[PDB]
Amino acid sequence: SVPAGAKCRLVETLPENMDFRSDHLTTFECFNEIITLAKKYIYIASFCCNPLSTTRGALIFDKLKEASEKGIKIIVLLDERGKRNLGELQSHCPDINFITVNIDKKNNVGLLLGCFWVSDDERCYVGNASFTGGSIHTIKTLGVYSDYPPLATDLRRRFDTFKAFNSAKNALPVSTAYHIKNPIGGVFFTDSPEHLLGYSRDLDTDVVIDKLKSAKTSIDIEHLAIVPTTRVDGNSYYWPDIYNSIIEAAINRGVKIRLLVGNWDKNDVYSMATARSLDALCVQNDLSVKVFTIQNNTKLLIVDDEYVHITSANFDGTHYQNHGFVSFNSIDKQLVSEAKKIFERDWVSSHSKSLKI
Template identity: 25%
Template sequence: MRKISLCALLHVLLLFINCYCEVVEDNCSMQLVESIPENLTFSPGSPTHLSTYNAWRYLIESARATIDIGSFYWTLRGTPANQDPTDCEGESIFRALMDVGSSEKVKVRIVQSEPSSEFPNNDTAALAASGAAQVRSLNLERLVGGGVLHTKFWIVDSKHFYIGSANFDWRSLTQVKEMGIMALDCSCLAGQLSKAFEMYWSVALPNATIPSAWPPAVDTQFNVHSPLCLQINETSSLATFGIDPPEFVARGWSSDLDVILHVIDSATTQINVAVMDYFPTTLYDDPNTYWPIIDDALRRAAFNRGVRVRLLASRWNHTFPDMFNYLRSLAALNGTTNENHAVHVEAGLFTVPSYTERQAKIPFGRVNHNKYMVTDNAAYVGTSNWSGDYFIDTGGVGLVVNQTGTASDDLIQEQLLAVFNRDWNSAFTTIL
């Protein structure tokens, strides 16, 4: 008789306890999607994945009825003051959206953060003016007292979606390092993400207010304590979304912060984080305040449970210098001991070099913009940087996937771990 490991048995029990949706998506597929900046080359044999550009093109070409997009800002097209030979992929996505939206066969809706001089809306204004898209702007400053809509996702025909770090910016396709997930034929998960879109859409009007209670249409039964049970890449999986800020946490939802904390607290052997900014404070308040919620969770995992923690932040032209101090403070735990185990905490900085003068002059380019975490039992991909502002008054979503029931290199978390190890061990990373 074949023996079943305790880990596998616990996973099966978890599936039965936590799954409240019949597994109907036998063909649900999910894959990692990356943007690798021009000329950034890893060693031979390093993992590679579908490009963000090709994923977005595929979603547009797959659309038969609807495309719903949640976004921060739009600069897919180059401008006379900001042009580059590599902006052609952004131009291509813009033209494809214009074409599909103008066909009258596909309804395109876009919700974006309130435009400003720093983050204009020229692209979406053109799409709206041509009739290719309905566009609404969400003013979180007015609604919740601060922040922006920082989310980045696509939902196509209520069954396909993309979520990740890539903004609707040509640089996010060719000059910025991004990580995301594209899912196909995942109607249950896409349905939950659609509820996030509908919340944004409903209050992205001049006189709208946050309701005292969100309508039942945006409620969900899926959260970190009762995730959706489904087949992803022919593997039994658990998955759900989280949403922030707190005012958007409708009935049944987990906040994005709670999803992150749950993933950290559930890790048993390792936690690997890749995020552009890491601060146990707020960044954009006046004055800023101390906000150690995630930092404390990482320290507890390392010190109390002996979990190996690695955190990879980004160094570029716009890095806040104080981040180095916070990373060193976290890494200072490394090598200490607690009873029967050593404490392993490391922090590193990933730098995207500029190989030409042209690349060096690209504003807000050449940066590792990733926002993900992978542990021994879960993969998390989000849209927020890790400082207090992003969870207090900024709009963001995050997806967590757990596939621990099967040992396979095809699992999303194994693929994401391979990407993290590729970056961590590359010549572009400096360990503090």
């Protein structure tokens, strides 16, 4: 049979200078386990690659260096804008193959996110902890680890999609085995963007909005910002698709929504008006907003204590229209309950003060 939850367990980074405590697997322990149990390959993908920035990030880079010398095919995908440290990486690991990826060469807007590991088509990690020393040591992250072969194999097919966009000289099946119409143990992957989706994969933009509109009781979102206007290039881009489905739940359906976003800029007139209007919604409706100032890459979504959505991208226009990433989705009640515990901890954390304007 198929195990419930697809052998998935929560993984996150809790720095020492932060009051976050949990019994889940740490990101440092997760990456070290993938390298130790590696017998065939290690495929890593993220935007920026800079493990040598912290102590724990350098140890993971050393275990990965020893793996490539033992005969393990290690491929690291990184967007061509995180190419600043490329000369530093190849000088330390001549065996690890580093590949610069530009998924959007037509307009140069789409960035490579992804943020996932996969090894031997058995073990894998999916979260917002990039291959940087910060995400492993000093920055709060969140993700899921799974040693289930059928699930990690479906994630490796996502790696084959992004690998084809290497910036070198000159067929892609865009294959998937599980989606919202056929999950594996109550777990499936949503993908992005739409022009790289193919015909079988599920667009993460549609799946998130569908779960936001199908909400019945609670909506818990811990992202960096929900400001529906993000500045692409040097101009403003208005995209309230996710921002509307949330307020539609709080006003029309009376959903108790708690948003934990990062602190906004005092000079950004766009983030100012977004915040002052969320302040007015907390008075009339059951909306609650708290802000944080720490370095946190967590992108969490929980609906009705029944569905969970952990991703590396942020709920905004720039990400869900151009950026390419893989998002974790699960409806397993036992796995969602563990994610609910994480949001309750962060909501009352000392680093989460109530929104004041």
